[PDB]
Amino acid sequence: IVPQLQNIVSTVNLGCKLDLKTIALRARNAEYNPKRFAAVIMRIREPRTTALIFSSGKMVCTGAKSEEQSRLAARKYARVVQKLGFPAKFLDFKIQNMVGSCDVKFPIRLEGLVLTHQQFSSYEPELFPGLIYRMIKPRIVLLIFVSGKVVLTGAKVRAEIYEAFENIYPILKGFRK
Amino acid sequence: TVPKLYRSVIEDVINDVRDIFLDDGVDEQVLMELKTLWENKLMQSRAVDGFHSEEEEEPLNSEDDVSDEEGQELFDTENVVVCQYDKIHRSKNKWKFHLKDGIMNLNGRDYIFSKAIGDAEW
Amino acid sequence: TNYKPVANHQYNIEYERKKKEDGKRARADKQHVLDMLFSAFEKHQYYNLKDLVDITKQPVVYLKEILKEIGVQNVKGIHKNTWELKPE
Amino acid sequence: YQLYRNTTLGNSLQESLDELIQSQQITPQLALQVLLQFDKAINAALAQRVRNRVNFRGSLNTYRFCDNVWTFVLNDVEFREVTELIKVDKVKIVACD
Amino acid sequence: AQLKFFEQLDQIEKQRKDEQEREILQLRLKQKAKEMQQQELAQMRQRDANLTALAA
Amino acid sequence: IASACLYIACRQEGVPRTFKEICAVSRISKKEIGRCFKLILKALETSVDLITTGDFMSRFCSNLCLPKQVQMAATHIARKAVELDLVPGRSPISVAAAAIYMASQASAEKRTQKEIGDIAGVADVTIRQSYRLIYPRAPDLFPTDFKFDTPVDKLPQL
Amino acid sequence: LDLAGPLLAFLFRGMFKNLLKEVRIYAQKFIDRGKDFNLELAIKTRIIS
Amino acid sequence: SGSSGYKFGVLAKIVNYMKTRHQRGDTHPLTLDEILDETQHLDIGLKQKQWLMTEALVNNPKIEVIDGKYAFKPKYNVRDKKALLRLLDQHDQRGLGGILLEDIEEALPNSQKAVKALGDQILFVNR
Amino acid sequence: FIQMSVQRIVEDAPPIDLQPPRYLLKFEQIYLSKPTHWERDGAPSPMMPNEARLRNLTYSAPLYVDITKTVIKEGEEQLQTQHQKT
DSSP, X not given: OOOEEEEEEEEEEOOSOOOHHHHHHHSTTXXXXXXXXXXXXXXXXXXXXXXXXXXXXXXXXXXXXXXXXXXXXXXXXXXXXXXXXXOOOOEEEEEEEEEEEEEOSSOBOHHHHHHHOTTXXXXXXXXXXXXXXXXXXXXXXXXXXXXOEEEEEEESSHHHHHHXXXXXXXXXXXXXX | OHHHHHHHHHHXXXXXXXXXXXXXXXXXXXXXXXXXXXXXXXXXXOSSOOHHHHOOOXXXXXXXOOSOOHHHHOOSOSEEEEEEEEEEEEETTEEEEEEEEEEEEETTEEEEEEEEEXXXXX | OOOOXXXXXXXXXXXXXXXXXXXXXXXXXXXXHHHHHHHHHHHOSEEOHHHHHHHOOSOHHHHXXXXXXXEEEEOTTXXXXXXXXXXX | OOTTTSSHHHHHHXXXXXXXXXXXXXXXXXXXXXXXXXXXXXXXXXXXXXOEEEEEEEEEEEEEEETTEEEEEEEEEEEEETTEEEEEEEEEEEEEO | OHHHHXXXXXXXXXXXXXXXXXXXXXXXXXXXXXXXXXHHHHHHHHHHHHHHHHHO | OHHHHHHHHHHHHTOOOOHHHHHHHOSSOHHHHHHHHHHHHHHHTOOOOOOOHHHHHHHHXXXXXXXXXXXXXXXHHHHHHHXXXXXXXXXXXXXXXXXXXXXXXXXXXXXXXHHHHHHHOSOHHHHHHHHHHHSTTHHXXXXXXXXXXXXXXXXXXX | OOOHHHHHHXXXXXXHXXXXXXXXXXXXXXXXXXXXXXXXXXXXXXXXX | XXXXXXXXXXXXXXXXXXXXXXXXXXXXOOOHHHHHHHTTOSOSOXXXXXXXXXXXXXXXXXXXXOSSSEEOSSOSSOOOOOOHHHHHHOTTTTGGGOOTTTTTSSSSOHHHHHHHHHHSSOOOOOO | OTTTHHHHHHHTOOOEEEOOOEEEEEEEXXXXXXXXXXXXXXXXXXXXXXXXXXXXXXXXXXXXXXEXXXXXXXXXXXXXXXXXXX
16 A cells, blocks of 8 residues: 655745735735734645745745645745745755555554554544554654554655555554454 | 615714714804715716615746736726625635625625625635 | 533633634734824823733733833832833 | 725715815814714614525635735625526625624 | 804813812713723724725 | 543553543543643553443443443443444443443333433434444343343334 | 530531632632633532541 | 823824934934824824924923924934043043943944944943 | 531521622532442442441441522623532
């Protein structure tokens, strides 16, 4: 089974002062609420991404299907800010979070995973139906369900998400109902 | 009842500001002239019927386009709707609008809603 | 004598109120806040800092800096310093 | 709200007051006092006049939020009022808390 | 305008009546407080008015 | 922190208590107590053990004033259901409430599902869905040594 | 000659006033927050027992 | 509310603006009407403008008017930012009680002033 | 004392008001129960005096009261609550 990326989270700093009120009014499809957040929210129809705009100029992009799409959307948002008269540069661009979702296609026993790895997986039925599994070797959190859908999130790179799923795949096959 | 409501508003405003005109020392006849002018303009427009009328960082520009034009939004031909929003709800790209006490000018006609529900996709 | 609520009723009432109303806002329009401070100073020589916090949505820390520029807090001999407009 | 001042009835009143100021028939700033009184009267009338309850389907083009005021650009939106059905290519809706 | 000038004097006579209520007790204080309550609402309205002009 | 630590202590003791009961005596919401409980688990490096349905069954049946034999039958139904996995990935309290309702209806001392739901703390609709899932195998779930005032075939379905 | 029940009643009255004082302190804190008030939280079971 | 004209604190804001332009370094003589145009308070009404000149300007205790145009009430002395060493040379006046609060607004930022003070013989003691 | 004095002491209590919304609490009917001992599971068992000596249990009976809560918000609106057997 191959994990499919759902969200690409990237932080890029414009490096110039931004006026939030001016950006919200001038930019199309821009909503800013000061009390809720200091982030001006701007979205573009072609790529489904959310942009957070701050006086520092750091911009966060979330919900991008692919890493290339996230960078392209950030470039489009930055150039729109440049059109508003605030200079925009790409500085310290990095992907903080990559989320991958895949289905094993077989039922998995949550109780068996807890018994073998109480330290690795902490699961409480009342708090949430899905088991929560954390593996030391890959830096990501794995969600295991009776359906068998697996969600991996918090990995810096796509390769880590794939590696974690492959590492736990024999364990899931062992607990297959 | 939208024309009747507008005529009632005209009478209430003139009566309330009559005292202010007296305090200023402006003649009551001038206030009556203002009331006549306000009624006359509505007759000229013909919009509302009136009882009185009846009487690399550097090449950002290289990725050009991909932005909707700001000028398109304002043409002055847009239908004008004035309303009060109880709340606005957005899920994903879908938008839900809750409005109250709103008058909508559509097809050169005025429609008032006690409450309205609008579903739109962005 | 044992009951099983998911959350305490009083806690949920506060949580709904917190979402419905945000106490203060962000630090913006300092000049507009300065004009509001001038209006309070015109109304009374000394205005309590807590009363000024209710008047302006500017954060107490930012508001104190604006107050410091146009006014000095005065004990009045009763301690409990109350901000008053500078004679200078 | 001062949004109601920007209406065909409100605009005609504002211009008529300006004509009186131009002739010097009314002292300057008298128009502002009339507009403040107009806002109180219009808000009260809107609050308790009663109206039809209706629902509409549409497509959203642009959204603007500032000063707790929602501005929406609506394209190809169908409005249904009772039996009547309204079709307009372009409509602008402004909502004030 | 001469008539307007003694019209103001009648308002001053009302202020003298206001001094009589002040010694008895609150009308002058109530009127000033009401204006201040209106001013806070007016400041919010003034910000909204600029937006309506900018929008259309 | 105190409420979250108490929930972990119940797991260490081997006699778990419902989170909702901790919420009843604590101003803090269940979500915040649960988030703190994860942080305390990391701090004390405590292993996680699944909660036991039987401990919950005794207290709820005592509140209902159900006879001990009815309580034993309900516990047997819940234990059999989890092994059969008739209900998939379902919290024990919801399964226990459905088992109690089935046992009460068969017994002379019938208890309404909504009254059991208030005592359990689970939603009445959730119990009804759980009861429907275990209803086809309900005769198998019941212990062989039981007396039925009402037959499983004639048992009311909710 | 004092009977056992009146001696118990006098002490119980002292426990009851202590319980009422605890309710007032808890209520005052809840009133200051203004979120709401719960009498069951205000009463202390331990003082009487 | 005693005596007030239009928006409250307008007279105090006008005095503050007169100080602000001097700190900015752009200095021009301004009539009361000219200040109103600069602050966008020109439409304050005839009565309010008359009240400011007749009573509000006179009311300020430290207000100084050179002749045709009024001068800033807070600081009569020009913010030259020069001859501080000469003030230091006379210890009888203790530098004329010079305050860093007055400085840093005359024409330079605090960061530049802090580097200059350390390099210069002049030193600052703050009780 | 148990049947009448305990009821009289709660009945002869001034209402406690905290405010400015005011919350008023009144202690009325008293409810008493046969002595019960709470086990680790939390299921109550009727206390037996011979058993109490063996396990060092304390022989005591649970006490309950009816509390009426009335709150005025200063809006001329009163909310009434009927807590029973607290």
